[PDB]
Design a protein around this ligand. Structure first.
Ligand SMILES: CC(C)(C)S(=O)(=O)NC(=O)c1ccc(F)cc1-c1ccc2c(c1)OC[C@H](Cc1ccccn1)[C@H]2O
Ligand SMILES: Cc1cc2nc3c(=O)[nH]c(=O)nc-3n(C[C@H](O)[C@H](O)[C@H](O)COP(=O)(O)O)c2cc1C
Ligand SMILES: CCCCCCCC/C=C\CCCCCCCC(=O)OC[C@H](O)CO
Ligand SMILES: CCCCCCCC/C=C\CCCCCCCC(=O)OC[C@H](O)CO
Ligand SMILES: CCCCCCCC/C=C\CCCCCCCC(=O)O
Ligand code: NA
Length: 455
């Protein structure tokens, strides 16, 4: 029902008040009072808490409205309470946009981030975001009014001069209060993620086996590589053409056994490849050889030596010494899957930074979870009002206008998810990564604790 929807509203505003006001203000006290040094990150956390705290200080007024069913605080109260809510929206969305822009700058131009990430630049953008927020929410101070409707029942309702004004306000609120700032956020984090990304590695394993021993070693190093995130291509040397064979593979592993009667001869299937190994494109390519033999013969795995000699003479970068298996290969399986490990580490790409901003993407995602649905029903009510002129009713509008009343209560809830996220990510991982390591950070003024939470 319509009052059943309001039942969800009073609890959502109340639970947000219960989790928000203690949490957000505990954050503020531990920055003003506890931290004698307000760092750039702490200044951002403080303002994000101040924004969330202000909107929660008006929820009690909107509880009295839901309870008594009428507004008893006057025109100025209905004006002010909605104005400090609007600035809390525009501030929180541009402050998280700032955090995302500070992170892109830190990875894109590290010298410029080091140059401009000062407490002065912080206080300038913070005060700048605040001034920008106040003048973007002023339209609410004129579109809100207390109008008596039904007996002893007054509504703090948004009255517009026309549906064109209602449509402009809603699309302006949607664009300046979400679409435009979050478009800057997604572009930042897409570029941050487009840098760390890396195509999956491709490896080629061409083997020449007559009795199946080399085929076993090829298949075991193929399984070793594949389990480490490789795209292995295992081919018998009797079904391959030398022309452009290696083209496309970051790593090439050639295996072959020795088969000379009174000599060092190559395996039958491998001989045609070897004689045309120049057409493979081995020049400047990462390669490592393997193969089986028998120590009883005068030249143990002479095939591996001859192949490695040609690859070297063709300009190939031999990354590991040849894997020379004596006798039954499965009898030495660890030496095989261990040789494949060292080959990977010999060409392994640089270890990407293990400090990924999981906390800020949590703050951004949660903020997006509550405000994206609120701003699309704004756009949906605006698209209707721009032509259909429906408001508070309709066919889908009967469900849209009810959807706004639910998302409004959820908006008060978004103001209480940042402090729990601070503690959620903090205790969940730092305490789980050394309880003693945490105290050493907290023993100081407290600035190093916050910076470690934000990675
Ligand atoms: C057209 C309607 C009938 C829905 S109304 O619009 O008449 N409803 C109310 O007036 C209303 C009634 C009961 C109640 F408990 C709360 C509200 C309420 C409270 C605040 C706001 C509301 C609505 O809509 C905009 C903005 C959102 C916001 C932004 C930032 C943080 C949180 N919320 C903020 O100004
Ligand atoms: C006729 C013959 C000649 C061989 N010559 C050599 C050799 O010259 N050097 C060597 O290390 N092993 C030699 N071997 C041993 C093989 O390399 C060994 O059996 C190996 O496991 C063969 O592996 P594969 O056939 O599965 O590829 C020879 C084996 C045979 C049957
Ligand atoms: C619709 C109303 C809302 C308006 C929304 C806009 C708010 C301003 C946002 C970004 C401005 C800053 C963008 C540029 C920040 C990077 C500057 C930089 O990279 O610094 C290089 C400098 O030249 C080395 O000294
Ligand atoms: C303003 C946001 C700064 C980062 C945007 C950027 O440079 O990349 C955008 C690109 O389109 C994403 O791949
Ligand atoms: C959004 C608002 C951002 C306002 C930035 C204010 C100017 C920052 C100071 C500076 O550029 O030197
Ligand atoms: Na907020």
């Amino acid at each position: 029902g319509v009052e059943f929807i309001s039942l969800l509203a009073i609890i959502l505003l109340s639970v947000a008040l219960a989790v928000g006001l203690p949490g957000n203000s505990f954050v503020v006290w531990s920055i003003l009072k506890r931290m004698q040094k307000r760092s750039v990150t702490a200044l951002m956390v403080l303002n994000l808490a101040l924004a969330d705290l202000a909107v929660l200080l008006t929820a009690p007024f909107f509880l009295h409205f839901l309870a008594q069913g009428t507004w008893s605080f006057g025109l100025a109260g209905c004006r002010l309470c909605h104005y400090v809510c609007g600035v809390s929206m525009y501030a929180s969305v541009w402050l998280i946009t700032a955090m995302s822009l500070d992170r892109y700058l830190a990875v894109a131009r590290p010298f410029v981030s080091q140059k401009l990430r000062t407490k002065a630049m912080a206080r300038r953008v913070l005060a700048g975001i605040w001034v920008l927020s106040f003048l973007l929410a002023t339209p609410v101070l004129a579109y809100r009014t207390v109008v008596p409707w039904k007996t002893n029942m007054s509504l703090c309702f948004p009255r517009y001069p026309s549906e064109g004004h209602r449509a402009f306000h809603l699309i302006f609120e949607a664009v300046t209060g979400f679409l435009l700032p979050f478009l800057i956020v997604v572009a930042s984090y897409s570029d941050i993620g487009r840098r760390l990304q890396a195509r999956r590695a491709k490896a080629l394993i061409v083997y020449g086996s007559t009795t199946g021993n080399t085929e076993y070693t090829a298949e075991t190093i193929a399984r070793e590589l594949a389990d480490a995130g490789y795209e292995v291509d295992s081919r018998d040397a009797a079904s391959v053409e030398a022309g452009g064979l290696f083209e496309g593979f970051d790593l090439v592993l050639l295996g072959c056994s020795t088969w000379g009667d009174d000599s060092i001869e190559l395996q039958d299937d491998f001989i045609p490849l070897f004689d045309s190994l120049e057409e493979t494109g081995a020049q400047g390519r990462k390669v490592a050889c393997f193969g089986c033999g028998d120590s009883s013969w005068e030249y143990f795995c002479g095939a591996v030596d001859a192949i490695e000699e040609k690859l070297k003479n063709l300009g190939a970068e031999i990354v590991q010494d040849g894997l020379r298996i004596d006798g039954d290969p499965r009898a030495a399986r660890d030496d095989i899957v261990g040789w494949a490990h060292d080959v990977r580490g010999a060409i392994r790409r640089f270890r990407r930074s293990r400090r990924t901003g999981r906390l800020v993407v949590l703050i951004i995602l949660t903020f997006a979870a509550f405000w994206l649905p609120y701003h699309v029903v704004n756009l949906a009510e605006a698209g209707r009002a721009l032509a259909g002129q429906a408001a508070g009713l309709g066919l889908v509008g009967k469900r849209l206008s009810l959807a706004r009343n639910v998302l409004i209560a959820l908006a008060f809830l978004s103001s209480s998810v940042n402090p729990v996220l601070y503690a959620f990510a903090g205790g969940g991982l730092l305490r789980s990564a050394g309880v003693g390591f945490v105290a050493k950070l907290l023993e100081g003024t407290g600035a190093e604790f916050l910076e470690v939470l934000f990675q």
